[PDB]
Design an enzyme around this catalytic site. Structure first.
Site, PDB file in Angstrom:
ATOM      1  N   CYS A 199      39.912 -17.136  98.264  1.00 50.13           N
ATOM      2  CA  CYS A 199      38.755 -16.353  98.690  1.00 50.13           C
ATOM      3  C   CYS A 199      38.093 -16.946  99.929  1.00 50.13           C
ATOM      4  CB  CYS A 199      37.746 -16.192  97.522  1.00 50.13           C
ATOM      5  SG  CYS A 199      36.327 -15.111  97.926  1.00 50.13           S
TER       6      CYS A 199
ATOM      7  N   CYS B 176      34.254 -16.571  99.964  1.00 50.40           N
ATOM      8  CA  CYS B 176      33.671 -17.547  99.063  1.00 50.40           C
ATOM      9  C   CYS B 176      33.667 -19.011  99.533  1.00 50.40           C
ATOM     10  CB  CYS B 176      34.387 -17.502  97.713  1.00 50.40           C
ATOM     11  SG  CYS B 176      34.741 -15.896  96.900  1.00 50.40           S
ATOM     12  N   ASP B 177      34.832 -19.496  99.960  1.00 55.23           N
ATOM     13  CA  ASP B 177      35.007 -20.908 100.342  1.00 55.23           C
ATOM     14  C   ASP B 177      34.984 -21.318 101.817  1.00 55.23           C
ATOM     15  OD1 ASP B 177      35.174 -21.347  97.585  1.00 55.23           O
ATOM     16  OD2 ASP B 177      37.355 -21.243  97.541  1.00 55.23           O
TER      17      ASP B 177
END
Ligand SMILES: NC(=O)c1ccc[n+]([C@@H]2O[C@H](COP(=O)([O-])OP(=O)(O)OC[C@H]3O[C@@H](n4cnc5c(N)ncnc54)[C@H](OP(=O)(O)O)[C@@H]3O)[C@@H](O)[C@H]2O)c1
Ligand SMILES: NC(=O)c1ccc[n+]([C@@H]2O[C@H](COP(=O)([O-])OP(=O)(O)OC[C@H]3O[C@@H](n4cnc5c(N)ncnc54)[C@H](OP(=O)(O)O)[C@@H]3O)[C@@H](O)[C@H]2O)c1
Ligand SMILES: NC(=O)c1ccc[n+]([C@@H]2O[C@H](COP(=O)([O-])OP(=O)(O)OC[C@H]3O[C@@H](n4cnc5c(N)ncnc54)[C@H](OP(=O)(O)O)[C@@H]3O)[C@@H](O)[C@H]2O)c1
Ligand SMILES: NC(=O)c1ccc[n+]([C@@H]2O[C@H](COP(=O)([O-])OP(=O)(O)OC[C@H]3O[C@@H](n4cnc5c(N)ncnc54)[C@H](OP(=O)(O)O)[C@@H]3O)[C@@H](O)[C@H]2O)c1
Lengths: 309, 308
Positions: free
Chosen positions: A134, A137-138
Site C-alpha cells: 500500500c 499507506c506506507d
C-alpha cells in the site's frame, strides 16, 4: 452461541469493515453474530497505521486489539471460521466450515479481497521488512530513501506519484511496454525527476539482510538481469475480488467483479448488505477508515430492513 | 501562515470531516491549510462518543484533542476564522478577519447548523440529560424514561431505538401528523412503550443537578402536563448551508445540501465537500462517515491537483 439459533444479523468477515458493522449493529440492539477467519483481516500484514484519524501511529496489531475490544464491550459473539454458503429462504441460513449453520434476518458481507502477490523469493521473507502492498499507506515511511514500485495500473502509477514526493528515487517496474493506468498518471509521473521507468521487466527476487536491500530484475526482452539497490518495494499489481463467492451465492457483481452495492451498501439480494474492499464503492481507494464507515452504513441499512420487516 | 500564501488545498471547517480531509491531504504531500470557525464542530456539544471504532467511550472534548494532534503531527496549519467567500480567480478564499488565501483546490467540511429549540432549561441542563442525538446516546439510557421532541425521520428513528433501550419514550410533536416516512410511523406506533404526545410543545425542562421533568402544553386545549423523564432528546432537524452554497456557485440538492457524487465532487471542478454539509448518506450524521468522506474528498483533491 449454539449451532442453530437465529440472529437479527450475521456479519461475515473479521476485518475493519466487519468490526465497523458489528459496532453499529450491536449499538442498534440487533442480536448480532460475527463469523470470520482472520481477526483484523489485512491489518495482520500491516506495520504502523497512521491514516485512521484519532489512532496516531498505532501498530496494526494494537489497532486490531482495540477494534476487537470495542465490539466486545457490546458482547458481540465472534466465531473464528469460514462461511461456506449463504442460503435464502423468509430467513437466511449461513453455513460455516465447521461450527455449523446459523439463521439470520439479514447478512452483512465484509469479506475483503485477496491481494495479488508476485510469488518470487524474498517476498514473504521481507513482508513488513521493506515490502508493502500500500503506497498511500506506507509512503510517508520512506522519506529520503530509495524505493521500487511494481505494476503498471492506476495504483502503481498513483503509488509512484505519491512516493516521488517522499523518496529520493523511485523505480517504476512494469512488465509491459505499455501501461493500463490512466494516460494522465503516466504523463504526470514520467515528468518527475526522481522517477525512473524500468519497462518490459519483472522482479525475480527481493534480497536483503535484516531488511530489504535490493531488487533483482529481468528485462523480458533482452533476458538481461540487473540488481537495483532499494530500501523498499511496493507491490501494486492488483487484487482478486470475491467474484466466485458472490456468484456462488446469487449476488450481483459490477463490471470489475466486486460485490455490487448502492449508496447505502445494499447488494442485489434484499436483506444482504456489504462493506469494505469486497464492494463496488470507492473502488481503488482501500483504507481502514472507509471500510469502517461503510460497515456503519451497512449496519444501518440492515437495522432499517430488519425493523421494517 | 500569511495572507496571499498559496496552497494546494484549503479545507473549510474544523469538524471531523475537515480533520479527516486534512489528515489525508497532508499525507499526500499537498500543501494544506485548514480554515475553520469552531474546532471539533458539532463535537463541542456532545458528551461521550462510543460509535467511532477504536476510540472507546471517549469524551467528545478528548476526541477533538486527539483529532487536532493527529493533523498537527503533519504540521497542518489551522486558522481559526470564518470563510466568507470562495472565488474562482485558481481559488481565492476570503476570510472574515484574516485575509485572503489562494488554493488550487478547496474541500468544504462546513457541516450543518442544529435547529435551535429555545425553551427554558435547555441551557441549564446542557450535558445534564438533554441530548441532540438519539442514536448516539440511546445506550446511555437503558431502563430510563425519556422524551423525544420532533416529528421527522430523526425523531421517529430516535424514538425507535430509544424504545429498545429505555423504559418508555414520550414522542412529543407539535403537529397532528408526521413529516417522517410512513414506514417509520407505523413501526414506532407498534412499540408498546412509546406514548405519542401530539399537537404538543415543550414549555420547559426541569431538574435539580440533572433533567427530571419536561413541561408540555397541548396546543388544542391549552392543557399542561409535567412528564417525569431522565432524558430529553431534541430531534428537530438541521439547516444545511444552502445560502453559502448558492452564494459561492455551488449546487445543492432538493434538501438544500451540497450535492456531491460518489467521489465527493461538487458541481464546481476543483471544489469538493465532505461530512454532513453534503448530500451523501443524507441524515446519517456520524463522526465515522464524516471522517471517511474527508479521506475521499482529500483523495479527489489530490487527483485533481496532481493532474492540474
Ligand atoms: O478492509 P476489509 O474489512 O474490507 O477487508 P479485509 O481486511 O480483507 O478483511 C476481510 C475479512 O473477511 C474474512 N473472510 C473472507 N472470506 C470469508 C468467508 N467466506 N467466511 C468468513 N470470513 C471470511 C477474512 O479472513 P481470511 O483472510 O482468513 O479469509 C478477513 O478477516
Ligand atoms: N481512479 C483512480 O485514481 C484509481 C487509483 C488506484 C486504483 N484504481 C482502480 O482500482 C482497480 C485496481 O487497481 P490496480 O491498478 O491495483 O489493479 P489493475 O488495474 O488490475 O492493474 C494491476 C496490474 O499489475 C500487473 N500485474 C499483475 N500481476 C502481476 C505480476 N504477477 N507481476 C507483475 N505485474 C503484474 C498487471 O498488468 P498487465 O496485466 O497489464 O501485465 C495488472 O493489470 C482498477 O480497476 C482501478 O481503476 C483507481
Ligand atoms: O460532522 P462535520 O465535520 O461534517 O460537521 P460539523 O461537526 O458541523 O463541523 C463543521 C465545521 O465547519 C465550520 N464552519 C461552518 N461554516 C464555516 C465557514 N463559512 N467558514 C469556516 N468554518 C465554517 C464549523 O464552525 P461553526 O461553529 O463556526 O459553524 C465547524 O467547525
Ligand atoms: N432516510 C432516513 O432514514 C433518514 C433518517 C434520519 C435523518 N434523515 C435526514 O436528516 C434530515 C434532517 O433531520 P429530520 O428529517 O429529522 O428533519 P425534518 O425532516 O426537518 O423533521 C424534523 C421536524 O421537527 C419539527 N420541528 C422543527 N422545529 C421545531 C420546533 N422548534 N419545535 C417543535 N418541533 C419542531 C418539524 O415539524 P413541522 O415543521 O412539521 O412542525 C420538522 O419537520 C432529513 O432532511 C433527512 O434527509 C433521513
Amino acid at each position: 452461541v449454539k449451532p442453530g439459533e437465529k440472529f437479527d444479523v450475521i456479519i461475515v468477515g473479521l476485518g475493519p469493515a466487519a468490526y465497523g458493522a458489528a459496532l453499529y449493529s450491536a449499538r442498534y440492539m440487533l442480536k448480532t453474530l460475527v463469523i470470520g477467519e482472520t481477526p483484523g483481516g489485512q491489518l495482520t500484514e500491516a506495520g504502523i497505521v497512521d491514516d485512521y484519524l484519532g489512532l496516531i501511529e498505532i501498530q496494526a496489531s494494537d489497532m486490531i486489539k482495540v477494534f476487537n475490544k470495542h465490539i466486545e464491550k457490546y458482547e458481540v459473539p465472534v466465531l473464528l471460521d469460514i462461511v461456506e454458503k449463504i442460503e435464502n429462504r423468509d430467513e437466511f441460513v449461513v453455513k460455516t466450515k465447521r461450527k455449523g449453520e446459523f439463521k439470520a434476518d439479514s447478512v452483512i458481507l465484509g469479506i475483503g479481497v485477496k491481494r495479488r502477490k508476485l510469488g518470487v523469493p524474498g517476498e514473504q521473507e521481507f513482508a513488513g521488512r521493506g515490502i508493502s502492498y500500500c503506497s498511500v499507506c506506507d509512503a510517508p515511511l520512506f522519506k529520503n530513501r530509495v524505493v521500487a514500485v511494481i505494476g503498471g495500473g492506476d495504483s502503481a502509477l498513483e503509488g509512484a506519484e505519491i512516493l516521488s514526493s517522499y523518496s529520493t528515487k523511485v523505480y517504476l517496474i512494469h512488465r509491459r511496454d505499455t501501461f493500463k493506468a490512466q494516460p494522465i498518471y503516466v504523463e504526470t509521473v514520467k515528468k518527475k525527476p526522481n522517477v525512473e521507468f524500468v519497462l518490459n521487466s519483472v522482479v525475480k527476487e527481493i534480497k536483503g539482510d535484516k531488511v530489504v536491500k535490493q531488487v533483482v530484475v529481468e528485462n523480458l526482452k533482452t533476458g538481461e538481469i540487473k540488481e537495483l539497490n532499494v530500501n523498499g518495494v511496493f507491490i501494486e499489481i492488483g487484487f482478486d475480488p470475491p467474484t466466485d463467492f458472490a456468484k456462488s451465492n446469487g449476488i450481483e457483481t459490477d463490471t470489475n467483479g466486486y460485490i455490487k452495492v448502492d449508496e447505502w451498501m445494499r447488494t442485489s439480494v434484499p436483506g444482504v448488505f456489504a462493506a469494505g474492499d469486497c464492494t463496488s464503492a470507492w473502488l481503488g481507494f482501500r483504507q481502514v477508515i472507509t471500510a469502517v464507515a461503510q460497515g456503519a452504513v451497512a449496519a444501518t441499512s440492515a437495522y432499517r430492513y430488519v425493523t421494517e420487516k
